[PDB]
């Protein structure tokens, strides 16, 4: 969806995606 508190954009040097096989919030 889209809220007025979140802007729509995408920095060209970063790829927005998540691998389904890895759980995020880890390093």
């Amino acid at each position: 969806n889209a809220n007025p508190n979140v802007d729509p954009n995408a920095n060209p040097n970063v790829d927005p995606n998540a691998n389904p096989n890895v759980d995020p919030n880890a390093n």
Partner: antibody, heavy 120, light 108 residues
């Protein structure tokens, strides 16, 4: 195993032209672009024009725009410049730079540098 | 265009001391910084990206904090191997703009 190495660079004399090539080996140039950063002889770093992959939009610097031209090649993964009307303060070391960020971490590789001198 | 400045231009601190360097932006960069490091006669190496995370291979004494238009870097327990020049890069479009550079040394 990325081993970006570039050739060229020599005495140019004022008011002339030169060409440089930065061949890419160890990977396939299909995503994102390659930059070109120049370091003065003993000063800080500086930025020069960039090219996106497959002849896309190109942005130049502010003190260089209007005299430099950049393009890539299809059969062999290389990039080129063709300069003209060089002054005496364009003597520096030119690097080949490429980076982009992904969910697996950062990606960055750097060249080796060629010394270019302009004088009489 | 975005103009970046570094408040200190030369430092001289003894070993085992806390040092700090501040990079200040011009209009707005929503936490999109990166700090480099160049020893003499070499090529620069990335240290910190996104102003908070740490690249693999960097020791545990390097850390930094970020905000809208004010970023700092802190080195705790300085060792006599970190005598180099530190830059302040930004990336928010097709192109980058480097800072000016800061030198740190050891006193006696």
């Amino acid at each position: 195993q990325v081993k970006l190495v570039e050739s060229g660079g020599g005495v140019v004399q004022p008011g002339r032209s030169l060409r440089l090539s930065c061949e890419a080996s160890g990977f396939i140039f299909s995503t994102y672009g390659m930059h070109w950063v120049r370091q003065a002889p003993g000063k800080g770093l500086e930025w020069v024009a960039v090219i996106w992959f497959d002849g896309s939009n190109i942005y130049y610097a502010d003190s260089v725009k209007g005299r430099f031209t950049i393009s890539r090649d299809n059969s062999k993964n290389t990039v080129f410049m063709q300069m003209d009307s060089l002054r005496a303060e364009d003597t520096a070391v030119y690097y080949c730079h490429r980076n982009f960020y992904d969910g697996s971490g950062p990606f960055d590789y750097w060249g080796q540098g060629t010394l270019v001198t302009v004088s009489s | 265009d975005i103009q970046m400045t570094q408040s200190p231009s030369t430092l001289s601190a003894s070993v085992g001391d806390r040092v700090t360097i501040t990079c200040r932006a011009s209009q707005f960069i929503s936490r999109w910084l990166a700090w480099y490091q160049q020893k003499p006669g070499k090529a620069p190496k990335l240290l910190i990206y996104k102003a908070s995370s740490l690249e693999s291979g960097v020791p545990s004494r390097f850390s930094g904090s970020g905000s809208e238009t004010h970023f700092t870097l802190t080195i705790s327990s300085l060792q006599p191997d970190d005598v180099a020049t530190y830059y302040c890069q930004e990336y928010t479009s097709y192109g980058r703009t480097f800072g000016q550079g800061t030198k740190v040394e050891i006193k006696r």
